[PDB]
Design a protein around this ligand. Sequence first.
Ligand code: FMN
Ligand code: SF4
Ligand code: SF4
Ligand code: SF4
Ligand code: SF4
Ligand code: FES
Ligand code: FES
Lengths: 41, 54, 59, 212, 430, 66, 230
Amino acid sequence: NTTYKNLQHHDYSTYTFLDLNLDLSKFRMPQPSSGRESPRH
Amino acid sequence: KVDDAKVSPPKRAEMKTSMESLIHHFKLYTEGYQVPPGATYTAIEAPKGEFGVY
Amino acid sequence: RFRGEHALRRYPSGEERCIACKLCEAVCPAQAITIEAEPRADGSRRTTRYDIDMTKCIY
Amino acid sequence: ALFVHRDTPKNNPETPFDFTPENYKRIEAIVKNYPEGHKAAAVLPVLDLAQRQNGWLPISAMNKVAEILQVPPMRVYEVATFYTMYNRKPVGKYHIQVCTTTPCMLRNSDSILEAIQKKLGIKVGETTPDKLFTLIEVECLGACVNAPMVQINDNYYEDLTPKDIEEIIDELKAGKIPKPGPRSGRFSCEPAGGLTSLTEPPKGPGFGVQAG
Amino acid sequence: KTSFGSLKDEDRIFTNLYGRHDWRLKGAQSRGDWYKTKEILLKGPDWILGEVKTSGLRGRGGAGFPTGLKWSFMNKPSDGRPKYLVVNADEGEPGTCKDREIIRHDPHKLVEGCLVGGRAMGARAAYIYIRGEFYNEASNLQVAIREAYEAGLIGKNACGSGYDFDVFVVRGAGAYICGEETALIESIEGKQGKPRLKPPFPADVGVFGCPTTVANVETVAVSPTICRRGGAWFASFGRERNSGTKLFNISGHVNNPCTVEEEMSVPLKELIEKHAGGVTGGWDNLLAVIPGGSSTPLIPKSVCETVLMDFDALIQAQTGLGTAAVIVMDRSTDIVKAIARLIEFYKHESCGQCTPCREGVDWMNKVMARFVRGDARPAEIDSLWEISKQIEGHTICALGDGAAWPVQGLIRHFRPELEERMQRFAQQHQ
Amino acid sequence: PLMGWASTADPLSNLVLTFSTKEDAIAFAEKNGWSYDVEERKVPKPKSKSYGANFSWNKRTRVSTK
Amino acid sequence: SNLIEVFVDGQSVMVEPGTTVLQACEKVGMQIPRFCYHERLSVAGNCRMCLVEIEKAPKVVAACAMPVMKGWNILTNSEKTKKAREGVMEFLLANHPLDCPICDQGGECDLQDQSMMFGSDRSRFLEGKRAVEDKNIGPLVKTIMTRCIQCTRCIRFASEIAGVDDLGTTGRGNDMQVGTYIEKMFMSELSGNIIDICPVGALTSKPYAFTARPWETRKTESIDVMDAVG
Ligand SMILES: Cc1cc2nc3c(=O)[nH]c(=O)nc-3n(C[C@H](O)[C@H](O)[C@H](O)COP(=O)(O)O)c2cc1C
Ligand code: SF4
Ligand code: SF4
Ligand code: SF4
Ligand code: SF4
Ligand code: FES
Ligand code: FES
């Protein structure tokens, strides 16, 4: 076999990374805190 | 002179044109060269005789 | 190399050669140098009063 | 070079700056990945989004980020000056980055720079009096086994030659964006001659496992 | 024993490096990932650690430090703070082509290995730093993690087990210094990427105040294959200590430059002449070899004709064997100008925490430019040898050291050619 | 009034004496008679500093730039 | 229990846990030459002059922030200690221009004292010497950023104790400017404390600037006025 099995890479636009990052928001651990919301509140 | 710009203020090209000799020149004329402690003596044969300095 | 007049120089078509860096007052063996210094507003650093005691100069 | 701001309007806030509420939802995903206590850790992805939204970032973009991310603005200035993506100065729509340091120049980057220079006309490290053809030369990208290589915004161009340089430049002058893949064989990381690496179709999950 | 081993098929670590059969969760399933895996993951993590230390896995990424002992110190009992696994994905030391292709074609074995490492030491999630120059392969990785999450495979209660694990990927703002260990830590933080002090470890205090660990793509990708195979199989290739497999990747002055997987020990000349064509113009055409990366001194022809490719052999060659830039160079070319281009790379990429790397790299750049023009005296060139000895062991990160060492190799080997350039300019002004 | 100097009628304004302990100072001042004001010697304070608490997890010590 | 023994040049002394090598050396009296440490500021291992050799160690430990483990022995005056100090002093003195007369810290420099008592005397790297143009910080400070050795003492003190959060590092390599990027007039409280904490003549007093020099002035007792803190 000498056949290329990407070209799913071809159709990539600009915002697609954060598009996917929004697409994969849920089923996520509860983001453990460090006391407050920030070291300066 | 000696091979020490920490005691002898070095010559002009390295004094100017160089940073380390400018620094040693400056602090050598202001502070004076540091001297280790102690009490010494010497004496030479001056034409008057035993010139001693303590 | 004869050491007489204690005169000043200046730059080629230029300003006054001194800086008021006080090295001469720092090393003068009679404290015959007295340099009271202020900068002028032009940015180039200057003096007020440059003083040599010709009485006190050991040359 | 030139790390004084030198205000000169098109800067000096208020310069009008904005995002999309859809991009605000992107920013909510961005500060949804990071845990509580370190809300300021998303400075790098949010300012990456700012370069994605505007081809060069002005001062009011940094001011808007300093509003949003509860950050002191000087750290935003530091990260904007520090790295290499964030061209705070205006460039073309497409931006040309010629990667050439150690393997690339040792594999004849001279003809590549010649072809770019006497094809585009403007010089290295400079701009052009139009868009989409502003050029700098750059350090390594990673694809070292190929020719001294070309990068445009989020695309590569690998394994070239000065006539293919001129052809891809002419296609960009026509606006027809070329293929993202390389030219002249080895579409993947191939030994382009004998191909003495793996050839057989692999076993997969077939071989011997231990203590199942 | 063998003749220090050679690659025979089915002992390759992973196929489909370049363009081949499949790329999907179905593709990794057909290639042997997510196979017999959860029973191993629930068998006990210290068994996995014993498998890793049985393999004798030498540390990747140019470090060479034992990964098994590192993760065994990372088997500390828990605190009131999480534990993070960080994966470096930068191809520095130009000449590299290390894992751009790995992240383009096999992401899911990295998913395997990072799940194994996260469950292996009580970790909780994995941050994966990619070079930001790789947006297409980055979105490919994003689609792969999308399919992996959406297949009900990992996430909270990965494979429905009693263990949660997630992977977050951070794009690069663009820096070779972010390829380092602790400058990566402050690049994640939101600061500028600059390291910290070493006796407070990132294994002690890493990502914001948690004991984390940082590993190469290669260690993570080779990890679950050893966990699914038998013990000491990686310790059965070539020598004993420096054993197993490695990417021998050659760019530069060779016919059809490329990348191969091989075993750990191989003759260099036969490695070159059998895999990527040969040497351009024959074996007697060339002049020298830089193995070990851009952080490594050069090797001349008369030595490299017989030196077998091994860690201990290149320690005896007094060179720092990193990874994947194991290339050659020809004879008629300005190696002075090429090494000067490498010093230009070093000056364009270093932070300014430590004074001496900044100062020494600028001095070496200006003085090597003078040596390209050939203007100075040989006392100055021996002074450059002196200061290239003097810079080393005075920094935070090893970039100053990797700037010092090629100057050392060039001075140790190509001294009369430098004398020739100086004589050229002396007779030119004369 | 002619040169602009520090014309002073103070012979004793240019002395400084180097001592080892405070007892030597008290004995010397009572030996040579004139009055003395002795200030107390104020040493520095050995203060605890630590890089880990400089870069900890949930405290307020966070330099945010280095 | 609560006592850790270190052998400064053989001599044993008791050191509390959690403290640096430098507090032990000051406990026995040794001033390690230092530029970026401060005894009231947070510690960051930048200046590299704090190097010292502990035996059976190939690397050289930066003793500005090195913690003290069990039972040490330290060579303060080893040969490579002197080599490392001469080397770091040799590195610092290239990109610092010839300004010691027109500077304002003539008797009060730090490069000068430690270059006398630790460094070499015949410089190398005969050309180079980058020049960085300053900013307009404010009316209170005269600012020559060319003499800035980038020791990062103003930034740490500013952002922690002043909290003004405006001194920024811009760039990399030789081009690393300290200060606010957009030339904001640095006007805040305690903005006059910085002119002395800057260990080199990068920052100085605006009214005092070209008037006098510390070897002339005598030093005299006084207590703070207009404020009841003293
Ligand atoms: C100057 C410098 C450059 C580095 N470059 C890389 C690099 O290109 N790739 C990489 O994976 N790690 C790089 N590292 C990090 C180390 O190689 C690190 O040990 C590695 O990520 C994991 O090593 P390990 O095999 O012991 O886990 C670099 C470190 C330094 C100090
Ligand atoms: S103060 Fe004295 S030494 Fe300095 S520049 Fe003026 S005349 Fe020369
Ligand atoms: S050696 Fe240079 S690049 Fe590395 S941490 Fe120190 S200052 Fe930064
Ligand atoms: S700060 Fe610089 S110019 Fe000023 S006295 Fe020191 S070395 Fe000289
Ligand atoms: S301005 Fe002064 S205190 Fe600040 S980094 Fe520069 S030399 Fe240090
Ligand atoms: S140097 Fe051009 S790709 Fe690495
Ligand atoms: S004090 Fe400057 S580095 Fe330790």
